[PDB]
Structures are given as C-alpha cells and as structure tokens.
Write an enzyme that holds these catalytic residues in place. Sequence first.
Site, PDB file in Angstrom:
ATOM      1  N   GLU A 108     -13.583  -6.746 -15.640  1.00 53.60           N
ATOM      2  CA  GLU A 108     -14.879  -7.066 -16.161  1.00 53.60           C
ATOM      3  C   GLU A 108     -15.002  -6.444 -17.520  1.00 53.60           C
ATOM      4  O   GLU A 108     -15.017  -5.235 -17.616  1.00 53.60           O
ATOM      5  CB  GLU A 108     -15.879  -6.525 -15.204  1.00 53.60           C
ATOM      6  CG  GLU A 108     -17.280  -6.660 -15.641  1.00 53.60           C
ATOM      7  CD  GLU A 108     -17.652  -8.039 -16.118  1.00 53.60           C
ATOM      8  OE1 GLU A 108     -17.456  -9.020 -15.390  1.00 53.60           O
ATOM      9  OE2 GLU A 108     -18.159  -8.098 -17.233  1.00 53.60           O
ATOM     10  N   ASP A 113     -20.775 -12.847 -20.084  1.00 58.90           N
ATOM     11  CA  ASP A 113     -19.738 -13.787 -20.368  1.00 58.90           C
ATOM     12  C   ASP A 113     -18.346 -13.343 -19.902  1.00 58.90           C
ATOM     13  O   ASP A 113     -18.185 -12.313 -19.200  1.00 58.90           O
ATOM     14  CB  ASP A 113     -19.783 -14.043 -21.847  1.00 58.90           C
ATOM     15  CG  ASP A 113     -19.588 -12.792 -22.668  1.00 58.90           C
ATOM     16  OD1 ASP A 113     -18.547 -12.160 -22.542  1.00 58.90           O
ATOM     17  OD2 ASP A 113     -20.477 -12.468 -23.443  1.00 58.90           O
ATOM     18  N   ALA A 141       6.414   1.286 -21.718  1.00 60.73           N
ATOM     19  CA  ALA A 141       6.258   2.081 -20.516  1.00 60.73           C
ATOM     20  C   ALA A 141       5.074   1.699 -19.622  1.00 60.73           C
ATOM     21  O   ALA A 141       4.142   0.896 -19.945  1.00 60.73           O
ATOM     22  CB  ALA A 141       6.136   3.520 -20.934  1.00 60.73           C
ATOM     23  N   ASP A 179      -3.767   5.474 -27.825  1.00 58.34           N
ATOM     24  CA  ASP A 179      -3.322   6.280 -26.714  1.00 58.34           C
ATOM     25  C   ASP A 179      -2.127   5.584 -26.072  1.00 58.34           C
ATOM     26  O   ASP A 179      -2.063   4.357 -25.919  1.00 58.34           O
ATOM     27  CB  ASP A 179      -4.464   6.411 -25.755  1.00 58.34           C
ATOM     28  CG  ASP A 179      -4.065   7.008 -24.432  1.00 58.34           C
ATOM     29  OD1 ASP A 179      -3.883   8.216 -24.384  1.00 58.34           O
ATOM     30  OD2 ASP A 179      -3.928   6.266 -23.460  1.00 58.34           O
ATOM     31  N   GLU A 204      -0.026   7.627 -30.637  1.00 57.60           N
ATOM     32  CA  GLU A 204       0.525   8.729 -29.877  1.00 57.60           C
ATOM     33  C   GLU A 204       1.798   8.368 -29.137  1.00 57.60           C
ATOM     34  O   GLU A 204       1.712   7.768 -28.048  1.00 57.60           O
ATOM     35  CB  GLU A 204      -0.479   9.216 -28.860  1.00 57.60           C
ATOM     36  CG  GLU A 204      -0.001  10.418 -28.077  1.00 57.60           C
ATOM     37  CD  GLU A 204      -0.337  10.397 -26.604  1.00 57.60           C
ATOM     38  OE1 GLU A 204      -0.595   9.333 -26.042  1.00 57.60           O
ATOM     39  OE2 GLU A 204      -0.286  11.472 -26.014  1.00 57.60           O
ATOM     40  N   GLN A 226      13.296  10.544 -35.049  1.00 51.79           N
ATOM     41  CA  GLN A 226      13.719   9.165 -35.358  1.00 51.79           C
ATOM     42  C   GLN A 226      12.842   8.127 -34.686  1.00 51.79           C
ATOM     43  O   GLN A 226      12.445   7.155 -35.326  1.00 51.79           O
ATOM     44  CB  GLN A 226      15.136   8.878 -34.888  1.00 51.79           C
ATOM     45  CG  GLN A 226      15.765   7.570 -35.377  1.00 51.79           C
ATOM     46  CD  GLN A 226      15.937   7.582 -36.886  1.00 51.79           C
ATOM     47  OE1 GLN A 226      15.220   6.956 -37.666  1.00 51.79           O
ATOM     48  NE2 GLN A 226      16.893   8.350 -37.364  1.00 51.79           N
ATOM     49  N   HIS A 288      -6.153  17.738 -26.935  1.00 57.57           N
ATOM     50  CA  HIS A 288      -6.757  17.839 -25.609  1.00 57.57           C
ATOM     51  C   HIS A 288      -5.801  17.885 -24.431  1.00 57.57           C
ATOM     52  O   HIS A 288      -6.178  18.208 -23.315  1.00 57.57           O
ATOM     53  CB  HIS A 288      -7.745  16.679 -25.408  1.00 57.57           C
ATOM     54  CG  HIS A 288      -7.124  15.301 -25.489  1.00 57.57           C
ATOM     55  ND1 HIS A 288      -6.567  14.692 -26.545  1.00 57.57           N
ATOM     56  CD2 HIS A 288      -6.966  14.476 -24.392  1.00 57.57           C
ATOM     57  CE1 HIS A 288      -6.067  13.558 -26.106  1.00 57.57           C
ATOM     58  NE2 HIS A 288      -6.309  13.439 -24.825  1.00 57.57           N
ATOM     59  N   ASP A 289      -4.564  17.473 -24.632  1.00 57.98           N
ATOM     60  CA  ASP A 289      -3.567  17.479 -23.590  1.00 57.98           C
ATOM     61  C   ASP A 289      -2.690  18.731 -23.657  1.00 57.98           C
ATOM     62  O   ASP A 289      -2.532  19.455 -22.667  1.00 57.98           O
ATOM     63  CB  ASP A 289      -2.641  16.311 -23.720  1.00 57.98           C
ATOM     64  CG  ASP A 289      -3.195  14.911 -23.634  1.00 57.98           C
ATOM     65  OD1 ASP A 289      -3.959  14.575 -22.708  1.00 57.98           O
ATOM     66  OD2 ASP A 289      -2.787  14.147 -24.509  1.00 57.98           O
ATOM     67  N   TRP A 400      -0.346  32.138 -51.185  1.00 59.06           N
ATOM     68  CA  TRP A 400      -0.556  32.481 -52.575  1.00 59.06           C
ATOM     69  C   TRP A 400      -0.752  31.178 -53.276  1.00 59.06           C
ATOM     70  O   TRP A 400      -0.223  30.145 -52.856  1.00 59.06           O
ATOM     71  CB  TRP A 400       0.648  33.091 -53.272  1.00 59.06           C
ATOM     72  CG  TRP A 400       1.067  34.428 -52.711  1.00 59.06           C
ATOM     73  CD1 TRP A 400       0.737  35.574 -53.367  1.00 59.06           C
ATOM     74  CD2 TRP A 400       1.729  34.651 -51.532  1.00 59.06           C
ATOM     75  NE1 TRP A 400       1.178  36.533 -52.597  1.00 59.06           N
ATOM     76  CE2 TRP A 400       1.768  36.037 -51.502  1.00 59.06           C
ATOM     77  CE3 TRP A 400       2.281  33.908 -50.511  1.00 59.06           C
ATOM     78  CZ2 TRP A 400       2.356  36.715 -50.452  1.00 59.06           C
ATOM     79  CZ3 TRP A 400       2.870  34.578 -49.468  1.00 59.06           C
ATOM     80  CH2 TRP A 400       2.909  35.962 -49.435  1.00 59.06           C
TER      81      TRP A 400
HETATM   82 CA   LIG Z   1       2.782  -0.607 -20.469  1.00 62.83          CA
HETATM   83 CA   LIG Z   2     -18.018 -10.621 -17.758  1.00 61.94          CA
END
Ligand SMILES: [Ca+2]
Ligand SMILES: [Ca+2]
Length: 403
Positions: A108, A113, A141, A179, A204, A226, A288-289, A400
């Site tokens: 959703e 809509d 991943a 993320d 990230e 790399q 945060h991690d 300096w």
């Molecule tokens: Ca994935």
């Molecule tokens: Ca909807």
Amino acid sequence: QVLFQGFNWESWKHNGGWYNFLMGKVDDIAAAGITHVWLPPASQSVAEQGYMPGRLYDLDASKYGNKAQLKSLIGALHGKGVKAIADIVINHRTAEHKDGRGIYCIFEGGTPDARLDWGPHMICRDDRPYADGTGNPDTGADFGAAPDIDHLNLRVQKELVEWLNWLKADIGFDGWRFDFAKGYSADVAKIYIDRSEPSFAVAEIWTSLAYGGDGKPNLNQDQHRQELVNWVDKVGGKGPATTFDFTTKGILNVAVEGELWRLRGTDGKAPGMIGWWPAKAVTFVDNHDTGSTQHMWPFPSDRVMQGYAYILTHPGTPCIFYDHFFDWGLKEEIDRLVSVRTRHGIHNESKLQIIEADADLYLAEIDGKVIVKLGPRYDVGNLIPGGFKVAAHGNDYAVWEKI
Ligand SMILES: [Ca+2]
Ligand SMILES: [Ca+2]
Ligand SMILES: [Ca+2]
C-alpha cells in the site's frame, strides 16, 4: 560541503518528536558551517526507526513526527541555507496485506489510488516466501527480514521515481542517502539518481575490511575501497552520486589506538576511498549503526576527536554525527575544526600530503595551508614549517594553519 546526520538510533523515541526537537537545533547547525543534514526515514515503517517501510507516501505515521512537521523542519533548514537530504530505503518494503496464500506480499503506497500498491510480482523472483516466482531475480543483495523489490520491473521504476520527485517537490528534500545500496545494482540506482536529479546523493555500501593473521585489518584495503570506487563509476562519475567511505572509518577505528602508521597506505597515500577518489567519498567517524546504541563498529570514544581532527582537515566530504556534536560536549572543538576547514577553503579535492605516519604520530599537510597532527608524540617540533600558528588542539591532535 560538510554534512550532518540529524538523528541517531534512539531519536524516534524522543518526547515530543524528533522533527520538533530538531527545530530547536537549526540555528546551531547552520552556524557551524554545515551545508546538508541527513534526516531519518520519513515514511511509515514497521520498525520504529524507519528502515522497514510500508506505505511510502504516509509520512504521518512516522515516529519522528508527521508531514506537517517535516515540511516545517525542512523549511527551517532551507530558511537558514541548509539542504535536507533523505534516507531512501528502497531495496526492500514491508507489505500491508496478505494475498490469498496468506503471505504478506500486498503493498500500500499510503494513498487512495494505486501508487505503489504492488503485489508479489514486484518482489524479486527468489525471495521466498514473499515472492511468487514471477518477478525478476534480485539485482543485488537480500535483506532477510523483508520483501525485496525487483527494481528491474518498470512499474516499480516509474512509481518509485514518482515518490522520489514527490519528496523533492511537495516535501522539499534536496538529495538522497541510499540505504543498503548493496541491496540492488549500480545500474538500478543510476535510474533513480538520474531521473530524480538530486543536488547530492550518497549511497551506503558497507562491507568488511580484510583481516590478517592477528585479528586486525590489513593495511592494504584496496579490494575494499575499489568496491566504492566502482559503484560511483558505474553510477556516474559526473553525477551527484558519492558513497560513504567505510574504508577510512575502518582503518581509522584502529589507527587511532596507537597505530597511526596505518594512515599512509601501501602507496604513500591515504588508505581510504579519499586516497583514490576524495571527491566522491564522504567521511564519518560514526553513524547510527556503527555507533549510537547499536555499537556495530564504534570509534574508540576517548578518541573520537582525533577522528574529527582527521576527517575535518582532510579531503572527501565530512559528515558530523548528531551525538558527537550535540551530546558529547564536543560542539566547540568540532566547530573550530569546521572553521579551520572553511577558512582555508579545504574541500573535496584538497591536495593531501602525508609527512609522517608512525605508530604515535600521523602528521599531514592539506593544501599547503593546514597541518594536522594526530598522536601523543611530544617532540613534533621540527616537522611543522616556518609560518604556522596553531589553530586548534585538544586531546591528541593539533592543527596548524599557515599564518
Ligand atoms: Ca535486494
Ligand atoms: Ca493505495
Ligand atoms: Ca528479503
């Protein structure tokens, strides 16, 4: 461009709302010379901190506060010159409804809509149990806990680019933080960068450093940077895309505990991504991690200031973390470093020259105008040249500046 992370793992908990709370720190953030602040995931999400999103268009179910509050905050930031950037979590999505099979695989978007109301077909071919076999295989991943989105699907591509442009337009975000950008391919990301055209986008990509026969990272982490260099490359060297330099964060974590020789790599240049493509690298001491209450990969606390002394004077784009600045009592030294940095026009691509990187002394010169010494080495004397006054110093750093 010095970025700020306007949240940490506990921020959603805040009495009275994080966005509201953060209204009160806007002047200070602006004064510090901070050009961009990274805001947490704005929409509805099963996990309170927001990295498990469902109704992408429902900002009002955020625990950080609601749409109104977000546009007030982003207005404030914009009112005082700073750009807001958003944490885009689009590798995976959680579903709202069970299809008949009994699997939560019907989404959703948040509106009456059909925008973003996908079903199991948009889930990557093999992500069982959610996926019904008909989608494309995952371009990257997997994230265990949720449905992975098949970014090769065209409706997913159009409605997700729609949501992005809506966030710049109605809400006012300036750029993106991707993320788990390992979750999907650089090609997929490029479609989203390119078609929503942000003024900044950092991804990230977080993978492990290599460890030798000692339990400690190698000095040569070239396989690791790399990977960062290739994402920016495939995505668009000329685009706004950049990646967090997890290689300098990793090396530095260790380097600072009396192994500052680690800070000049195999090539006599900085070992991080900033030593190969400082322009596309944004550096951090913790996020945060790695830190906060997750402590996934902490910087030595008693040394986070040498961290900052290094990322604020060095090339790459520095990222300050809410906590260090506002809650650790380092506001002032952090500030001062940011000022040395802006005063001498140090930037992205400043030339860096390492003078010494011994166990107890890393001494380096940025753009011929600033010199940073990290370490307990007392007898630094003779190594810093004529016409250099000290700008800042503190616990095991001093910088300096050419007079
Ligand atoms: Ca994935
Ligand atoms: Ca909807
Ligand atoms: Ca999954």
